[PDB]
Structure formats: structure tokens, C-alpha cells
Amino acid sequence: KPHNVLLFTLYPNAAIIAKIADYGIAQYCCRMTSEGTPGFRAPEVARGNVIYNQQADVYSFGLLLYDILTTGGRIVEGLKFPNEFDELEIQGKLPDPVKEYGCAPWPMVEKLIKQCLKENPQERPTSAQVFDILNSAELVCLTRRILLPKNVIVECMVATHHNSRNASIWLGCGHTDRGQLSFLDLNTEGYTSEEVADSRILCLALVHLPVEKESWIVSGTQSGTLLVINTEDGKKRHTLEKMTDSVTCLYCNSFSKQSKQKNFLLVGTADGKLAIFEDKTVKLKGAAPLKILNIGNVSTPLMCLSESTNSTERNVMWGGCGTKIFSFSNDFTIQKLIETRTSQLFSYAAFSDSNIITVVVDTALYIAKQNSPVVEVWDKKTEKLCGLIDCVHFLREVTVKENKESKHKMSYSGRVKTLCLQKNTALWIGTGGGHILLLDLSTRRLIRVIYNFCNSVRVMMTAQLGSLKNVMLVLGYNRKNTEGTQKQKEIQSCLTVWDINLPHEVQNLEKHIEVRKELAEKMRRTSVE
């Protein structure tokens, strides 16, 4: 019970925090509360018709996880309804920990409760398992998984950071050839549908103005209709100057070079006709494309854009285009034209002779190609391949024994789909499979691979939510071959929210267990000594 757990310190990253009082069992194993306290009690022990099992301490522990989650909300209300404090839980009919009591979801432990809270005794996870799935460092960071409606195909997202009271994630749509935006809250999870264009949408961006207290959203679609709608009013829309190819990448920058606040927007067309704009001019129908910088050719489509990590160098932009990476500054002219296909480290060619997908800016440059299981660590000045990090060099090292059938799967699946770089700690790589890579760019490469939570990590980016900032949105997929024989698959997009402190937690926890294993053995020696 929450009364038999004796805390030792309130410092999270400590070695000895909780300790269950062990005197109780001594008084029982000698003088044999044998039925247990009413509220914190299993169904097999209250009915009294069956001898106990180790699976009784698990149902009792499952409830302990229910009072820690809800911060003792069942007990407080259980003191003025004690006959319903026991019987309500004595059958597995106790309510949802979130819908009843206000608490953060923690959706990888609401599942561990729903396992330790099963009626059948031998169906509850044994004590060794209830710890081996608490030792995971991915259960303690996954903030809330949000099941999207059935059969919704989204491939683009954008967050709202100018409002930190609460946030929403403006999505897109792919299950229709005619595009439509899909607003989505975060605390109410109300998925909203609103058709806004006649061609499928490819990317969005969020432009805010420090005046008038509004933040419009922009939409890039395959036809080229650049449409803009207000945050509040879903009726004031103006389709800007149509482009020639399919818009593929937009952005909102930090370019305040007139001694005051000012900003632009960079529509990435599918040949390089990057039209630059202004932050306050977006309202007018058919704005002025300031400097349309046709970079490549129709056979060279832009597929990404980025911005520097530091603000000291005046936020030098580094955007990809086809296979040719470039950059610019306040001048809005190419100052670098690094090219990757001409790479002299050939083991395979088309990994570099393919389209770019994303590039992140740091003390080096990390680049992603289509169907490329490798990221390319280029350099800014030298323009050389300073590092080549293949994916399966990590995946194939854990997928040796726990994956046996893969011996016929030499045509491996799982390719880099998106990059996201934490401030200075790690690099988040979203594979085409269900994995997500945590690479510590400083010292050691592989931190952990967080698999078996989706099937295709298609979009990934960071955000800040309700003063609990610094989360990492991860929009994966999920497909079930219920009717695979009908050459169709049922896709279920599964947005998640990872605590950005994940690469620390996963290695801070793996030390936390080592120190306790070193103590669990030395404590066994005081018996023999």
C-alpha cells in the first residue's frame, strides 16, 4: 500500500529512493491483515476461496501504480466512500486514471496498469516482467500518444509556439487527392476537418506577426496554390501567387536586419524558384515575391530547408536542392554550392546520386537522401565527407537473436526519413521502419534505438507545450494487414510526444541501474561476511 513504501529522499537521480517496509512479512511468516487492506487488494485474495499467488502482489502493485499516477486521488475520495473504495476495484472496474482524476497521461504506464489489473491471476505480468518493462527509458519520456482518427494519411505538421498557454498541431491530409487541413488540439484531442484546397498539401509553415495578435498559417500544395488562413477565422483566405511546380518546403525565419522586427518566408518549389516574402505582407492577396532565385533546373527539385544553430553568425540558412546543397544570408545570394554526387568514398553510388530530403545545421552538416540508409557528415568550410554513419551498422547489431526470420530479409527496409538535432546533445533520426535513432554527436554514436512503437516514422520535429516546453513530436504510422490479400493496407497514423530529455534519461537510467546492481550484490555479501 502507499503506506508501506518508505521514501528516503526526494532527489530523482538518486540511488536509494523508495524502500518497502519488510517487517510486515516477518510478523506474518511467524504469526500466520492476511487478507490485505480492503482498498489495496486483489480479487483472488478478497474472495478468499482461492490460495494466493505471487500474482497477488502484482495486482496490489498495479494499484500502487494507480495511486502514484493519480497522486493519491483514489485514496482521498476512498476515505468518504470506503465500502465503494474496495468493491469498485475488487472487480477490475476502476475508472480511467485520466478521465476521472486530472493528471498527465503517461500512456506507457496506463498500459502497465491495464496488465497488472487483470482478473485472471496467471494473466498478470510476473514480478520479473513488471520490472523489465519499467527499466525501459522510453516509458518514462513518452508523454502522450494521440491516436488519430481511423484511416487518416498525414505527412506534414506544424506547431504553435507563440501561444504557450496551450498548443495545437495543424496537420495535413493525404488520403484525398484534394488537399485539406486537419486542426488538432492537444488537451482535448479534437481532430477537426476543414477542406481548404483542391490539390493535396505537401508542407506548411506558421507565420506570426508581433502586431494585431494573430498568427496565420500557410499551405503548400502540389498545384502551387499558396493559401493563408487566420488562426481564429477559418473564412478569411487568399490564395497567393501560384507557382509553377509543386511546393515542397516552406519556412519562417529570423531576419530582423532593419534595426527592428521583420521576417520572410521561403517557398521551396519543385525546381528551385525560391520566392522570398515578408511577414506582414502575407495578408494581401497575391503578395510580392521579393527575390525569386531560380537555383537549379526542373530536373533538380528542392526538398528541404533549414537555419543555423547559433544566432551569432546571423542565422546563415543552409537549404538543400536536388542533390546540390547551398546557402545564403541577408544578401540572398548563393555563397556555397557544395555538391554530394561527386563523392570519392564510393561503396555504393546512388546513395549520393539521389534527391536530398533534409539537412540540419551544426558545427558540421548532416544530410539525408531518398531511400538512403546513411547520413552524410559534410563540413561547412572544407566541403568534405568528414563522417558517414550507416543505419544498419546499429540496427543489425541488436536485430541478431531477437529477430531470427530476417535471414531471408537481406533486402532490408528502413531508410532515413527525417532528421532532428537536439540543441547540443543528440541527433534524432527517423528510419523508414519503426525505429528512431539517438546519436550522441559529441562522443559516442549509439545511445539507444527506440523501436516497436510505430511502423514508419514519417514526420518528426520539436515544439514547446504549455510552459512544459521542449517536446519532440513524432508522427509515425501503423498498418495492419487485415485485408492485405485485397492489395490494401489499413493505415493508422499515431502522433506521439517524446520528452526532449530522452537521450539523457536513457543513459542516466542505465547508470541508475548499474549503481543498484553494484549495491544488490555487495548487500548479498554482508550475509556471508
Binding site: 526526494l10 532527489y11 537521480n13 538518486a14
Partner: protein, 364 residues
Amino acid sequence: GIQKCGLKVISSIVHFPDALGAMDSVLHTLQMYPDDQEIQCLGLSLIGYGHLLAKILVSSLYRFKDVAEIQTKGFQTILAILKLSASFSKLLVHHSFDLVIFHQMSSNIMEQKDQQFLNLCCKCFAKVAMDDYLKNVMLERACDQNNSIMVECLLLLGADANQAKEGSSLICQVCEKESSPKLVELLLNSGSREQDVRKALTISIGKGDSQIISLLLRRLALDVANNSICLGGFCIGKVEPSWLGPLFPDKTSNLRKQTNIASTLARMVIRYQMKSAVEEREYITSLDLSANELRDIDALSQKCCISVHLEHLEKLELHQNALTSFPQQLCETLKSLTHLDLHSNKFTSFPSYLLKMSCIANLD
């Protein structure tokens, strides 16, 4: 003064007809003409073709730490020996090799274009650090001598920092030798047990240090994710504002990147390791000072460096100390304390000015 000519002659014929007590005499001629006439000391070149060989190499390179490119002839010899007798490294580290390989990789080699050389020395170092035990002494023998650059390299290569005696270990040692703050910061941020860091306080508490203490408290008691300072169980005999200073957050603190030096050597060695292995605001609130036996807290009641972060405390615990006479000036400084408890102290009168506090509740 003829041994120079003798070795100059041997160096010629040792090459062409595939010559086969050669190594014996060419060794004693070093000990016979040492520390002088570096020309005969270039004989090291012939060694590239009884542990006395070890004691005569580390003593030769050290005594000529920065003499000339004889290190390039020394390390070439040491590299040639290693690739055929891998066991030899157990003998080098046994001697003064640490004294000579730490100097080269740190004698301002960065910012100097001797890339040809460093690649040699890192290749030589790539083998001395192969054994799991050798790193644990390549490291330990880099902490006695204050060397921040190398102690960072041996950590990115493993070499756990919690292995020396368990009851006693690196952090307890590094705190006795009056080390540099940059040296402690690397052991804590790496693998380092709590039971050893805590013992480093009492060692470093006896002496008055403002930067070696404030780096141990930051790892022992600071929950930045929850804005707290859990200094409860520690039996710190007295608290001073100079320690808690660096714990409170600062927005101006922003640094350069200088540790990249040790990061380069970390991968260069790792590169030669594999290539030889493959082929062949947010003001914190909770401040707990419970078990610290404080007979007085006056040290905080001044206008010290923390008197601007205490004005947002919102909780302060001083229970189970041996306090008395809560200072009048303090209880007017922390104008946002809303949960104060101080019980089991040896008070003898209610201060009666505690209630003058701005926004207090739950006085205990």
C-alpha cells in the same frame, strides 16, 4: 667520442645485406653516453629493427621532451615494437610513458601544423590503450598530474572512474590534490558512483573551496527539472553562500567550445583503433537544508551573491538542525517564502518577526 661514428657505420650496413649481440651493444652505448651528444642518441633509429628496452625509451624521450624530431624517431621505434610484441605496452605504461605521451599530445600541438607527427603519436597511443586495465592506469596516472585534456580523452575511450578502491576512488583522490575545477567536472559527468562523490564532500569540506564543492553539490543535490536543492541527508557542518551560488541558475552564462581538442584525439585514436582492428528565469524554489548540523545560518543573512535568488524561494526547510535565533535580516530578504519549517532545532523563543514575512504559510 667514437660511438657516434660506430653507430653511424652500423646504421648503413644494418640495411643492405639484411644483417642478423647487435641490439645489446647499441643499447649500452646509450647508457654510456646519455643526456649528451644527441647525435649518438639518434641510435634509437636502429632499435626499430629483458625490459631494459622500455626503461631506455621513456627515459630518452622524456629527457628530450622538446629537443628535436628525435621523438619522431623514438615513437617510430615504439610503434614498430608494438605491432609485433603487443605485450610490450604493459611495460611502457609501467614506466614513465605517461610522463612522455601526455606532454607531446599537449605541448601546444593544437594550433601547430605537425599533423604528420600527431597522427604517429595517436597511432602509438592507440595501442598502449588497448587493454581494459591499461586505460584504468593511463587515466589514474593522468589525474595525479593535473591534465584536463588527457583525462577527457581516456574517458571517451572507456576507463571507468569508479574503480580504484571502491571505498576510495578517483574523485576522493582528485579532491585531495587541490585539482582544477575542470578536472572534477569530467569525472562527475561520466560514470561516477554516488557513495564516492559524497565522500568527496567531507574531504573537500574540510578545506575551503568554492568551485570543487559547488561542483559536487550540483551532482549530489540539484533537481533542475523540478527547481529544487535536496541537501537534506548531508552532514555539512555549515552552509556558505559561495557554495550555493553556482547552483542557482543564471541566464548570462554562455561558453565557448574548447574541449574539442580532447574530442579530436578521442576519435583519431578510435580511428586507428578500428582500422587496426577491422583489417587485422525559472528561479528554483525548493531549498532543503534538513540534516546538515548547522549551529548557525547567519552566513546567508548578508547581502551575498545569492540574495537575489532567495527572493523567489517559496519553500525552505531547516528541520533537524541545531539552529537558534533565525536572523532578523534574512526573514525580510526572502519575500516569497510560502512554506517554512524549522523543527527539532534548539530554539528558546519565538522570533516573532517571522510573521512580518511577506507571503508565508505553513510555518512549522
